[PDB]
Design a protein around this ligand. Structure first.
Ligand code: CUE
Ligand code: CUE
Lengths: 233, 9, 236, 12
């Protein structure tokens, strides 16, 4: 594995370079928001984002060294988490709003159009506020997102934790470089990692919500999305 | 699975 | 202003250790094997009794007392099963293949099969337990993580009191690891490793919460009113 | 009314 020999600067560069694009939604502004249409927009966006996510994960240092079954397992567990932390990050400077896509900006009241969704919106919006108050940096976000990928399904595995330690080394390097004292560094590291607990909680909720919408037959789910959902069921 | 294909290809 | 911010790391550790709840016992009925209802009955009865001790454990966690009643309720409602679980996982550490629900209730994975959907929960808990074992988790670290769960799990479902107290506990964890002789790199690496476990414990709680809800609907186990209200807070 | 309310006010 050549991921263990990366300096923290190189780790950051690789992660930044591997970043997926910000996809647009198939939003038609003229079309009045129904539950089915809104859910259609969200799941269709997710579907196109998964493909970029797959190719992104392969460029996360260490992920390639894993076997195919393990690569599958990690993405199956963490995909909604990764979608969500991306959304939260994109929505940082849009208070009271979630930027699912540049053309799909939704506030709380619109989440009400889909039953059970607004509670998820509130949690996402609060995560976005948290990142904003912390002034989350781009370099930190990509470290966090990669952590999610390797951490969420980990419970060989020793290699996974070696890379995870590497990313912690990276986060700390970022913080030291921004001028934080040692105390501030470990404190910020903790604040950032404790966010991952709530992202997990949200994903668990969204996964259940997604499963209910499938059984509701409201939105046609893509075959890939239908398989990513059976991983948790 | 589909995920397996994309990861492999 | 809270007395919690002026505590030293030593004083933080001592307060948390002194706050630890007792290890309660389960029924001494040696009738084996368990039925689904009897096993569920034991777990929920134990959980019911542990909740009472959890409550005044919480009120002895530095900073928690300075919270309004409503805010205290929100945190406990959000974290109570996590807190039960990390306690279970801690007690189970020296029992590699088993889960020590109580000193007289030591269950293996296979016994999880006596309740439907429980074996998957047993597996996650055991995996967390082995993880704590390999990391050589210390008691002083454990109590730090458990209080963190209390203060953190509900903090975003509501430069403020709780986060300042969370920062305090973080400082305490670092202090313990330095005192144990770890390098700086080793210190923040171990800190990270431990906090990431909390993500999994959160996951387990959500599985367990769903499983508890289903048994409630199955009407297999008579659930206490306290336990039902704690379950209602998560609202499925 | 809440049982949790009673436990917290009466904690020891
Ligand atoms: O929370 C989310 O964040 C996202 C972020 C993206 O970049 C794309 C899609 C989603 C998305 O689709 C859902 C469907 C449900 O039934 C429930 C929750 C979500 C949800
Ligand atoms: O995971 C657990 O850890 C515990 C730890 C304790 O100290 C007491 C009780 C529990 C407990 O009761 C349950 C009921 C369910 O239907 C599913 C999971 C659990 C579960």
């Amino acid at each position: 594995s050549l991921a263990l020999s990366l300096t923290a600067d190189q780790m950051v560069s690789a992660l930044l370079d591997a970043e997926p694009p910000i996809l647009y939604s198939e939003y038609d502004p003229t079309r009045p928001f129904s539950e089915a249409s809104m859910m259609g927009l969200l799941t269709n966006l997710a579907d196109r984002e998964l493909v970029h996510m797959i190719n992104w994960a392969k460029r996360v240092p260490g992920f390639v060294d894993l076997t195919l079954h393990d690569q599958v397992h990690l993405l199956e567990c963490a995909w909604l988490e990764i979608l969500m932390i991306g959304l939260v990050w994109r929505s940082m400077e849009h208070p009271g709003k979630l930027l699912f896509a540049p053309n799909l900006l939704l506030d709380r009241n619109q989440g009400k159009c889909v039953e059970g969704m607004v509670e998820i919106f509130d949690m996402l919006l609060a995560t976005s506020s948290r990142f904003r108050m912390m002034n989350l940096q781009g370099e930190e976000f990509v470290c966090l997102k990669s952590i999610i990928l390797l951490n969420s399904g980990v419970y060989e595995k020793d290699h996974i934790h070696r890379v995870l330690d590497k990313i912690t080394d990276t986060l700390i390097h970022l913080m030291a470089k921004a001028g934080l004292t040692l105390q501030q560094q470990h404190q910020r590291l903790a604040q950032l990692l404790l966010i991952l607990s709530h992202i997990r909680h949200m994903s668990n909720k969204g996964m259940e919500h997604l499963y209910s919408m499938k059984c509701k037959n409201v939105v046609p789910l893509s075959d890939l999305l239908l398989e990513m959902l059976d991983a948790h069921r | 699975k589909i995920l397996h294909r994309l990861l492999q290809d």
